[PDB]
Write a protein that binds this DNA or RNA. Structure first.
Ligand code: CA
Length: 579
DNA sequence: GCGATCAGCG
DNA sequence: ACGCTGATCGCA
């Protein structure tokens, strides 16, 4: 129904200096995945190319790698990475419809061309799920059906660039697309393709030791419970705790008794078994998610894991990381932290370098709220998390453990993002009356933060959305909801999203500036991971001293705020040691 | 497939 | 009854 040329060879009119390009990778994880078909739409017509002909054609490969031949695409990182796995470089992507839709409205959840096109009343393209099917039925359709689908997707991109750019421009987001998110997409593609090397010998030894400890603890649990059961069965775990042993019920779920860690910790005075259950779960989590789960996704020939950073998923502008998630590798308990010993440089005599913004969202908050006291604190480079731990636990600076400071961190963020006296009292195991007074004291020291929390909710009501420093946007329809509980969740989103989102904007700019600086200095150092406000690199040991000066400076100077930004950084033989 | 749970970032 | 996530697991 849509006209196109099913081409048998590449012709010069397919190699124009502006085109919509589709390089179709159907598998969810695009690492080392098949490219099933290619479509090109430009001024001269519409073309479908089989990958075996197009990607072996030297002129088509050259066109893909020529940055002066501009391509408009949807999810260009998926294409870039799949092409890297084919030994082909993609350059010249000047418009990514996925990132444009994400910026316009992240709540749309746009995950294919059809969903983006619907934002602009364009419906002459099918959803990918209607074409490929779902689950066990998923399959590449017959070539004529595939070709028309890929051509229709390219035609949609070709038509949709201008109205998406026009709305981006009206939102003050066109530079956010072109100078931040699209350059970041190329950097993430390099990081994902580079991967992180894993010490599978050490990981597997840890797993064998874990399984022994797990059985020991499992037996002591059966013995403390007087009987055996399925320690992961709620119905059975609930029976043991809250019926057999008759422990108090502090919380319910929609489905029954709650056994979350906060509940178990409050029951520790009543019975030894709850601490064993906690230890059992923590070891099991390491075993299932971080030993077995990681070994599953290691590529055996290179011993590398290749995450996918989802750049158009979170509602605040953060990235997320999937299969494996390398943004939640354990660190806080020593037993879990040892997992990071398995993350190693990819070459001999290279090292891992990790750099982290200090108290990033409080510094962003001080800038946006213009709170005199919070700005003065960071101008003094005070550690507000430590200062809050001193006050909470009534200790001196010297006595603050990493654990008190971790807890004080949740108090600081809890309060500025709208925690109630009830929530605070439950977190600190303190009186509700004390919790409320401490919150009141907190806002006496930082009245500008209070004013900002009030103003930003009003602004979200008037405008219908909130923005970040670099003009990311999040619509909050529920902020005028008549339902108190629904309105309240929206109000805490108005409080949090501009801060968490501006911190996401800053580190993204930092990554672009860092990559350019590393290229300027002709260093071999390169990014491996981003963990929200931390950057993890690897480099030859001979570059470490230059990186100690280069990286903190690039990160500190990415933006200029009313308070300084501050970067902590370490390096070492494994990720474990980069602290 | 979903809810609880828990690993991380703030 | 602070916010943003992803993986595993049992299923009340
Ligand atoms: Ca930090």
């Amino acid at each position: 129904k849509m006209a196109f040329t099913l081409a048998d060879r590449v012709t010069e009119e397919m190699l124009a200096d502006k085109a919509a390009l589709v390089v179709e990778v159907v598998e969810e994880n695009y690492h080392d995945a098949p490219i099933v078909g290619i479509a090109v739409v430009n001024e001269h017509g519409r073309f479908f190319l089989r990958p075996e002909t197009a990607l072996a054609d030297p002129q088509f490969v050259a066109w893909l790698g020529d940055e002066t031949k501009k391509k408009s695409m949807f999810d260009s990182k998926r294409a870039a990475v799949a092409l890297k796995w084919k030994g082909i470089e993609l350059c010249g992507v000047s418009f990514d419809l996925l990132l444009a839709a994400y910026l316009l409205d992240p709540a749309q959840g746009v995950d294919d061309v059809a969903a983006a096109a619907k934002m602009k009343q364009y419906e002459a393209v099918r959803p990918d799920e209607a074409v490929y099917g779902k689950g066990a039925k998923r399959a590449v359709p017959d070539e004529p059906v595939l070709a028309e689908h890929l051509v229709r997707k390219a035609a949609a991109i070709w038509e949709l660039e201008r109205p998406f750019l026009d709305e981006l421009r009206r939102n003050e987001q066109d530079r956010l697309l072109v100078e931040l998110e699209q350059p970041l997409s190329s950097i993430l593609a390099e990081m994902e393709f580079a991967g992180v090397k894993v010490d599978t010998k050490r990981l597997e030894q840890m797993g064998k030791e874990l399984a022994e400890q797990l059985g020991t603890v499992e037996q002591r649990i059966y013995e403390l419970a007087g009987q055996e059961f399925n320690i992961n069965s709620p119905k059975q775990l609930g029976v043991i705790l809250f019926e057999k042993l008759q422990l108090p019920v502090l919380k319910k779920t929609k489905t029954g008794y709650s056994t979350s860690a906060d509940v178990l910790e409050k029951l520790a005075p009543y019975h030894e078994i709850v601490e064993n259950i906690l230890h059992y779960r923590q070891l099991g989590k390491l075993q299932s998610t971080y030993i077995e789960g990681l070994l599953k996704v290691v590529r055996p020939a290179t011993k590398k894991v290749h995450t996918i950073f989802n750049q158009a998923l979170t509602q605040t502008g953060r990235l997320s990381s999937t299969e494996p998630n390398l943004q939640n590798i354990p660190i806080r308990l020593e037993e879990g932290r040892k997992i990071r010993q398995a993350f190693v440089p990819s070459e001999s005599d290279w090292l891992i370098f990790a750099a982290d913004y200090s108290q990033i969202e409080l510094r962003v908050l001080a800038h946006i709220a213009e709170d005199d006291n919070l700005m003065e604190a960071f101008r003094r480079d005070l550690d507000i998390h430590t200062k809050t731990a001193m006050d909470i636990f009534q200790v001196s600076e010297d006595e603050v453990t990493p654990n008190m400071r971790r807890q004080a961190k949740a108090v600081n963020f809890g309060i500025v993002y709208g925690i109630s006296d009830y929530g605070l009292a439950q977190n600190l195991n303190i009186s509700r009356k004390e919790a409320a007074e401490f919150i009141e004291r907190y806002f006496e020291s930082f009245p500008g933060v209070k004013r900002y929390m009030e103003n930003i909710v009003q602004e979200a009501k008037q405008k219908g959305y909130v923005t970040t420093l670099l003009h990311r946007r999040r619509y909050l329809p529920d902020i005028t909801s008549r339902n108190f509980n629904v309105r309240s969740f929206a109000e805490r989103m108005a409080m949090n999203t501009p801060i968490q989102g501006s911190a996401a904007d800053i580190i993204k700019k930092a990554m672009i500036d860092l990559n350019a600086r590393l290229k300027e200095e002709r260093l071999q150092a390169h990014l491996l991971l981003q963990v929200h406000d931390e950057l993890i690199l690897e480099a030859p040991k001979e570059e470490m001293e230059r990186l100690c000066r280069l990286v903190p400076e690039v990160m500190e100077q990415a933006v200029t705020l009313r308070v300084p930004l501050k970067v902590d950084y370490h390096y070492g033989s494994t990720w474990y040691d980069a602290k």
